[PDB]
Amino acid sequence: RIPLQIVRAETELSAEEKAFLNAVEKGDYATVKQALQEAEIYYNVNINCMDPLGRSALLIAIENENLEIMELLLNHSVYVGDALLYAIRKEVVGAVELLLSYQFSEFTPDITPIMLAAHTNNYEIIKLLVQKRVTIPRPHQIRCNCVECVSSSEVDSLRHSRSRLNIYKALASPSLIALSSEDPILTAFRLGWELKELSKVENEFKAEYEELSQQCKLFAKDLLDQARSSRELEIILNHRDDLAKLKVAIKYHQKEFVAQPNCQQLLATLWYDGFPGWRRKHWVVKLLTCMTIGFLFPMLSIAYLISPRSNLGLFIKKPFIKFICHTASYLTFLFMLLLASQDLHVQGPPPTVVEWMILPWVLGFIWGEIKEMWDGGFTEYIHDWWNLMDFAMNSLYLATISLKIVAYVKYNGSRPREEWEMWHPTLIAEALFAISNILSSLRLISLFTANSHLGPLQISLGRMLLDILKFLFIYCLVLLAFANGLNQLYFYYETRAIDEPNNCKGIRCEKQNNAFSTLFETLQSLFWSVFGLLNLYVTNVKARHEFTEFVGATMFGTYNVISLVVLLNMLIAMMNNSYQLIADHADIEWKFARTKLWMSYFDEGGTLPPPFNIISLIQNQHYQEVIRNLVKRYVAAMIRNTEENFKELKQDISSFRYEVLDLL
Amino acid sequence: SPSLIALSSEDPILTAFRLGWELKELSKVENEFKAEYEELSQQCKLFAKDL
Amino acid sequence: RIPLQIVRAETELSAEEKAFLNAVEKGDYATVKQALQEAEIYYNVNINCMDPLGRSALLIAIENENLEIMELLLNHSVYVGDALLYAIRKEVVGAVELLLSYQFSEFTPDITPIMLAAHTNNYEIIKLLVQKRVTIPRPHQIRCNCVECVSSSEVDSLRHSRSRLNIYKALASPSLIALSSEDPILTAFRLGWELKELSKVENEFKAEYEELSQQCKLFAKDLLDQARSSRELEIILNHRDDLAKLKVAIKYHQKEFVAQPNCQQLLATLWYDGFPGWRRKHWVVKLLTCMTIGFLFPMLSIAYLISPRSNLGLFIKKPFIKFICHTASYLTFLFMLLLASQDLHVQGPPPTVVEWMILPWVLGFIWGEIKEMWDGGFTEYIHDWWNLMDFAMNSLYLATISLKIVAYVKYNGSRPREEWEMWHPTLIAEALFAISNILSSLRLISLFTANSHLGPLQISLGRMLLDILKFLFIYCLVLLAFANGLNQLYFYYETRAIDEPNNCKGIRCEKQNNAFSTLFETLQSLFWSVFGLLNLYVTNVKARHEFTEFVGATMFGTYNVISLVVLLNMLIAMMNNSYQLIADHADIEWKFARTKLWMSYFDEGGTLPPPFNIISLIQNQHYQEVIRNLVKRYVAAMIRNTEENFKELKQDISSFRYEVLDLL
Ligand SMILES: CC(C)CCC[C@@H](C)[C@H]1CC[C@H]2[C@@H]3CC=C4C[C@@H](OC(=O)CCC(=O)O)CC[C@]4(C)[C@H]3CC[C@]12C
Ligand SMILES: CC(C)CCC[C@@H](C)[C@H]1CC[C@H]2[C@@H]3CC=C4C[C@@H](OC(=O)CCC(=O)O)CC[C@]4(C)[C@H]3CC[C@]12C
Ligand SMILES: [Ca+2]
Ligand SMILES: [Ca+2]
Ligand SMILES: [Zn+2]
Ligand SMILES: [Zn+2]
């Protein structure tokens, strides 16, 4: 038998106090008034007594939305501490008004009335409290190192984090941004960015800051949604303190704001500047138009070079035409790259016709990269993540040019390639040019963003490359482990190349041999074993060491089971899970990426593709009027868009019953 | 609207078919406003099925 | 501009009729009574007038649960047709009572009050209507061919199917089975089975019959759940009209009823007959006990053979001990099968010691199979789906014995195997014995049901074999297509075996050749190409027919892309989808299969494993009392377990308001 008692005892109520609290709960005004008037004279009932749940008479009256009993208790001067917080959390406007006109707590000490109202996101109570001059303390820098911040963190790191989270919950309230904010959209953008940075910094409190940032982004998107005309939309997007605010939204990674259907419609209308009816056209018509504009890109470039002010000179400045011209230029460059591989004994030969036509494109690519670096800046250049591949391409092309020049000025004779040096400059130049061709042909992935059916796919692939990068670390660890083991076991039986059947040593011979004789060769053997191109007889030695052969073959089999069976299916499961997490947001991400791609063609700089590139207070008032209209519409829409309801209904019915019984 | 097709329509079924087809074509043409026209066409198809 | 009008016009109401209907809707009793009394004299208001929604005054009064206005309208003799159906569908007991005491319709003509009450599954109204002698028409056979059924199907196949579905919805009601049913459990079992058969037969109306059968199964499971003692449970399971009703539930594939925690507890208590505390034991203790009982299975079998009435004679009759003994016998049989492969030039050699010890096991297996066929019957034998593998094993073993006998009595000399005939009886006997060994070793899959961690897995694999069978058809179609094509292209260049390097022809040589020379060899080449064991040089001919070689290689590549890339990943997706559909029900399916496995060891027949096998009205009254208790408990539990509620609240408030205003 387990005895049950009250381990943490409290002060029980008397019979009269319990009767008074029950009368307050039932809403009987007459009995409560009589009890108060009698407590004034006899002092037999404590009006500030709690209940077994901790609520007092005032808290019970607030929870039941009984304004009459609330006012009756307030007129008798009951304890009122923290009652405003309970009235605000209950989201009852009349109670808040009555408390503005005049121990254990469910609210933390740092909670203030305005902060709690912002937490509740109730426009009425927030506006009530903002009518009075109320103020939220300013949060310090995300990485602030002042004496006050470190002192508060060392004294109490739980109180400090809780206070910061409460302040950022108050500031991130959509109703508190609709009011008391000069620019709600820019405030929402900055607040979302700062909350994302705090989520990055605060690891434990990450989900809350993430959801607050997402709430701010959704607030900005809904504010943009309330626009009802193109004039208002272009006033919003072009406000600067064109498309300045849209560029700011792109800077703060506001994907929901950018992917707005109206914003995307405006961007598409700007994108097809020359063609007014591109939206309603057949597939064959669009294909023929694109092919015709692409085949005429040198004519358009030359017309822009000669006279920019003409029917053909400024025709390339249109964003879609500019994109088509750049794509056609890159396609011709890749076609010449394909032609390049179509005497070969010359040591350091002069460049051929195809290479002489390739050189202008390489120079134009390098000049365009350095011009983008000089104009846009450094951070914008490194934020692209495609300028890395462009830098690799340009560096490899420059190395190819340098090695070609060196081999031309250091060699004159025509010696057959069979007796050339392994590190001959021509060979290194050819290898670097082949790698550069691979990279240049792979550079066409960035054009999948301009397509409707190839954009979300590319976004999904970019997002799934992160799971592959995560799996690559563990795969490489296992690979290094097994390579070290097999090398340690097999390096004793290394044989010279002359002893091999065809003077060939390694796994790239017809008969593979010395697969695990060195660390590098062991790494390559275990890499090629993933694809099955490593034969099983490589785990063999000429000596009759059957135990060593079996141990090596079993190491090989263990590596096969770990990589091909465990790691590969594990990576498949990882990618399968990661893809479903992008299925929903694929369209918004693609629209943001395509918006960036479109905005990249809106500038006057870089108009000519290679190789032709080497040859005012009314605004603020209009924006404020539009913002006022948007705020009104958004407040109305959000207003238009449990047991407490039934409890309020029961309280009303009981109060009406008691007053009818008293009247009759 | 299903109620507006139940009334003021000689043939509700053929009207629903044509309206679903035209809303699908508009969804194909109007890229930004695609989900709304898709759901309206699906609503018309469901109205015909329920009829 | 699209003009909008009323294409299907109706008869509009007058002002007085609309006012009367509005008074009925608002619940004002005085105005409605005055309107009725005035219509009696002046005949100005039609009391049976509809509304724009088709409802009359009586229907409006029923929908608002206004019993006073309902009775007032009934006393004035308003039209009452089909009002009972609306009162039943509304699930208002008082309205049904008032209508029992006394055009367009929302109910089909075949709907009757008792049928609609059964559809609503409302115990109160169903009992009300069953108090009166009410009767549901009997549905005919699922495959009935009488004149009435075919006549009704040919005259109106929509009315007939609708009537059948309504009747089966009425009969499958849990409340209508709680009442008016001698045995609710057996009725639920039979009804679920018949609804499943109807779902199989009625393809268009499949989901409805499936959900009705599942509802009946859940009703039976919940009736079993209401048991509160082991006595009641064993009374239910042992009722026969032991474990007779449990065997009936197993026969009707009642997986939810069988997998009941209390039923499974009783079956486990019966399963561990010898060990009372097997539930609370360590892993090592259970493992040692199982190993000890398995190593002593011949002693237990011999003790049962000599004296069944002893501490060891009847110790094998315990179900768990019997299962352990049979498993140990099969394990020893497989161990001897492994020993079997451990002079070989004898044509038709006599059997060795291992084969002489294997023969008793084979004879015992055959005798056990035919004894199961003779005892259980034919349908039960073919329902197992494992007796197919047992039949294959026994047929192959019998063929092995026959071929061994023939080779022994037809050959005496000792000729080396190199010059033996291809179809020598010894070779066929050895091949059949190897296939039999494969099948016997694969027979251990059926023992995974007895394990907790291996049972649901085996169920999932059995359920995923159906998707593989579905994919096999399309894979074989594509395989046959490409095999026919490659054969048609390549059969001209077939070369003799002597012309081959080592007098070897086919794909099983060191140098593969003639891979697509015949239909059979083409099928095998394309089969082995799935696993990559078919080299690429088989798509080559000695002649310089480069076009033919390229066309054949491209057929091969197309087949590779279709099978390995498309079909294989498609099958992976199929199995991935099909597995999640079994994840939820895996435990119940495993518990049903394990219950069947346990019940298989409850019989006296087949006690000795191979090779030792070849050497009363109180019951019904108790069951009825238990069933009455269960029905009461289930009704109470189901009773314990939208806009119409708010509409009823508003109607009550408005009626009270009007009566208060009239009184004052
Ligand atoms: C696929 C194999 C045969 C290699 C072919 C290489 C190129 C000829 C392909 C590869 C990627 C293709 C590009 C993928 C994406 C687009 C976007 C597309 O733009 C649109 O979708 C129209 C809508 C718009 O951009 O306003 C223009 C064609 C283009 C450049 C494609 C042109 C043809 C490209 C360069
Ligand atoms: C796995 C490789 C090495 C081949 C080994 C063959 C056998 C030695 C294995 C294969 C399947 C195993 C069986 C899988 C399932 C079970 C159920 C198990 O029963 C239980 O789980 C205890 C609970 C109960 O049955 O009451 C008894 C062991 C047994 C027969 C296992 C015994 C060992 C078996 C026969
Ligand atoms: Ca760039
Ligand atoms: Ca059997
Ligand atoms: Zn600070
Ligand atoms: Zn019939």
Swiss-Prot record, chains A, C:
Activated by G-protein coupled receptors via direct interaction with GTP-bound GNAI3, which increases the channel sensitivity to phosphatidylinositol bisphosphate. May be activated by intracellular calcium store depletion. Calcium channel activity is enhanced by MYLK, that promotes its subcellular localization at the plasma membrane. Expressed in brain with higher levels in fetal brain. Found in cerebellum and occipital pole. Residues 341-355, 406-427, 487-554 are extracellular. It is found in: Cell membrane. Glycans are attached at N412. GO terms for cellular component: calcium channel complex; cation channel complex; dendrite; growth cone; neuronal cell body; plasma membrane; presynapse. It comes from the Eukaryota. Residues 1-281, 317-319, 371-384, 449-463 are cytoplasmic. The chain crosses the membrane at residues 320-340, 356-370, 385-405, 428-448, 464-486, 555-575. ANK repeats lie at residues 14-44, 53-81, 82-102, 109-138. Forms a receptor-activated non-selective calcium permeant cation channel. Mediates calcium-dependent phosphatidylserine externalization and apoptosis in neurons via its association with PLSCR1. Acts on distinct neuronal populations in the hypothalamus to regulate innate behaviors including feeding, anxiety (flight/fight/fear), socialization, and maternal care. Homotetramer. Heterotetramer with TRPC1 and/or TRPC4. Each subunit in the homomeric ion channel (via ANK repeats) interacts with one copy of GTP-bound GNAI3; the interaction is direct and activates the ion channel. Interacts with TRPC4AP. Interacts with NHERF1. Interacts with MX1 and RNF24. Interacts (via C-terminus) with CABP1. Interacts with SESTD1 (via the spectrin 1 repeat). Interacts with PLSCR1. Interacts with PKD2L2. It is linked to Loss-of-function variants in TRPC5 may be involved in a mental disorder characterized by maladaptive behavior, anxiety, autism, postpartum depression, extreme food-seeking and hoarding behavior, hyperphagia and obesity. This is Short transient receptor potential channel 5. The gene is TRPC5.
